[model samples]
Every structure is written in structure tokens, then in C-alpha cells.
Target: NRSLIVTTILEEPYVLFKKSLYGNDRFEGYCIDLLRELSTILGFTYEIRLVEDGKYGAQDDVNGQWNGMVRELIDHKADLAVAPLAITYVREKVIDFSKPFMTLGISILYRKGTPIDSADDLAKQTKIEYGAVEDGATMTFFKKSKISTYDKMWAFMSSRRQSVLVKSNEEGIQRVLTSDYAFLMESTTIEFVTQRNCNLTQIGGLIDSKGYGVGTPMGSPYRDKITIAILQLQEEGKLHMMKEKWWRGNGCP
Candidate 1:
């Protein structure tokens, strides 16, 4: 069989580009390990490639066009999207997704000295600016929400989107460290960031629940198989073990 073309994005612990290598060997992270295990179990080989736009994926409202890994799948440019791609209703409608391999939720990442302890605190104040990754799931959540608090926060973010939203998680983290900003991102990434950056901390519990799953084009034969494999990994506790391998970090004082 031919090697599957796997499109992914660089995110710490999920997928990272390592030094001193070429091709797929250059990548090392939890998603890569999960891909390896899936390939071995499924008797297929794969070649990893990064998404050109560096975004997880998002659909444009004007033309109903998509960009990032989701577009890659929609165009059949890649056979698999193996990353921390969240399973959302919009994405599910466009492309089939394997059962969630990992669960997470949106949360706030802020500097430790900030008085903000929750989304409510951030929503109620104008002194500090807050935003999520531009065109990512977290932003989509806020934009589409009917809830008043989130809707109000979304209003503020939309009005100042140009200055508030960052392109990547790292950029959001940097803004948090460098300015009066709070970055709303996935809880899993928040955990990773706060663990390594002592000055930053998660402000509150998750705002909404979701999960990350392997993505494939709608009607792809591999969807069910990948779902089955993910289920197997979960049952064996291999998923937990893999997470431990990647997520374990030196504790903050």
C-alpha cells in the first residue's frame, strides 16, 4: 500500500519539529507517536507534512471556503490529518472524524499576577484584553455561542480582533507574558504552557468540552478503522501512557 500523506500543525507536545532530521523523522510528539502506533496496527505507512497555512483549520463565511488542514482533507491533498484537531460540529459536517483520541476544553491562560480568575471576570472588565487564536475552534466557539457572557466577550473580541487575536498559541502565550492579555485556548495546551512557564497560569475551569480526533475526508474508508484503533488504545490505557510520556513536566513551585 502507498504511504498516507498526513497533514499536521506544530504544537508543543501534540506535534513539534525537532532538530537534526529530514522528512517525517523531523517530527516528534504525542501525535507522531499515536500515528506510528496507528500505522503499525493498521498495516499502513505514512509521511508527515505540515499544513501550509499553519492554522488548525477554519471556514470562511463569505465564499464558504476553508483553509488549513480541513481544506487539505476537503481537497484530498492529504489522506490524514493527525493533530490536535478538535472535533466540532462544523468540522464534522465537512469531513469525517475518528472518535476522539483526547478530550479537552477551552480555558483562559493569563499571567499569574492578574486578578482575573474566570471568564466572567475577564468579560466584565475592559482594563485587560482577552482573545482566542484567530479562526480556530476556541474563537469559533465564542463567535457561535448563544450564551450571554460568552456572546458579550465575543463582542469585545470581535471589535478588537485585529489587535487582540494572535495567529498561534505561542504568539498568544507571548502576548500573555508581555502585555495585559488573557489568551483563551484549549485546556490541554493551557496545561502544557502553564507547566513550563511559571509566570503563566490557567485562570479557570474549561468553558466548553470537546475532544481531538483523527481527521479524514468525508466517506474515507479509514474513518471507522481509525476510530476502532483509538478505542483500542483507550481501552489498553495506551492513550494515558502516551499522554504521560509527552505531558509530564517539571512541576511549578
Candidate 2:
């Protein structure tokens, strides 16, 4: 087979551009390592490209159009989306996902010293605003939830989206650092961030469970193969090792 086009995003510790490299050589991190290992096992070559819009993927309500890596896969522009894309019901309707390589959940990230200890605390207060990344899985979860706390929280966020919802996790984290705000983000990312930024901490337990999976076009021949490879890596303990390799940080103390 010819080299497959791999669509990804530049997320810390998942995919990062090297200081002085170009093309595929320009990237490194957990996802890159995983891609390399998968290729080795499957005997396939790949070319990685960042999603142009820098979004994970979401559908436009008005036009029913998808964007980001999911769009590329839907249009056959990419053979695989090999980043930390979450496996969600809405997405599964249009594309296939390999068994999740990483399981995580949405949680609150806030500055230390805040009285907030859980989602319920955030939901009950207005003194500190809370939000998720615009068009992200976290946002989608809040929007789709039927739970009373989440429903109320979503109403608040949707009404003040321009001010509350951020364009990226980086922006949301900055808001938490600079203002009285709480960010709803994936637990794994919270762990990575809190380790490096001592001022930030996870304020609550997870809101809902989810997993990050490798995405492919619906009915892609590679879907099962990728799943099998992922399982193999899990069995060999390579997945855990890769996470440790990138997620290890200097002690906060």
C-alpha cells in the first residue's frame, strides 16, 4: 500500500513539532511514538499532517458539515486521524474508531485556593464562571447531558459562550490562571498540566467517562488492524510506557 495520510493536531505530549525538524521528522511525543510503533507492526508508511482548522472535530448545525480531522477522513483526504480524538456517539455515526487507547473523563481545572471541590460546587455558584473548549468533546458532553447540574451549567455556558467558551485548551488554561474561571477539560490533560503548572489543580472528580481512539473513515479496512495493534501494545505494556515517557514532569515540590 502507498503511504497513508495521517491527520493529527498539535497537542502537547501527544503531538509536538520538534525545534528543527521538517515533515514527519518535525514531530515527536506519545502519538508520534504510537504511530511509529503501529507502522512497524503493520508494515505501512504514513505522512502526518496537522488538521488545518486545528479543531478535534464537530458538526455545523446549519449545514450538517463536519470539520477538522473528522472532515478529512469523511472526504477520504486522510486515511487515519491518529491524535487524541475521543470516541463519541455522534462521531461514530459517520466514522469508525479503533478501541480506545486512553480512557479519561471530563473534570474541572481551577486555580488553587478556590472553594470549588466539584462540578456541583461550580454549578451552584456564579462568582466563578466555568466553561469548556468551544466545539470540543467537553462542550458537546455538557450540551448533550440530561443531568440537572450539567443541564444548568450548559444553559449558563451556552448563553455566555462568547465570553466563557474558549477556542482551545491552552486558552482555557490561561483563563483559569488569570481570572476567576474554571475550565472543563479531559482528566488526562488536567494531570499533564497540573504537574507542570503548580498553580493549577483539578478541582473535582470526573463528570463522565470517555476514551481517546484512533479514527478512520466508516468501514475502513485499517480500523480492525489498528484496533488489534493497539491491543497488542496494551498487552506488551508499551502504551503505559509511552504515556510515562511523555507525561512525566518535574516534581511540583
Worst 10 residues of 1 by lDDT: 16-25
Specify the highest-lDDT model's number.
1
Q: Clash number for every model?
A: 0, 0
- In TM-score terms, candidate 1 sits at 0.98
Q: Give all TM-scores, in the order shown.
A: 0.98, 0.97
What digit string (tens of lDDT, one per residue) describes model 2 on residues 1-253?
Answer: 7999999998887999887566799999899999999999999999999999988888887999998888989998999999989899989999999999999999999988767899999888788999998877888888889999999999999999999999888999999988889999999999999999999899878888989999999999999999999999999999999999999878575
For residues 207-229, what per-residue lDDT tens digits would candidate 1 score against the true structure?
A: 98899999999999999999999
RMSD of each: 0.9, 1.0
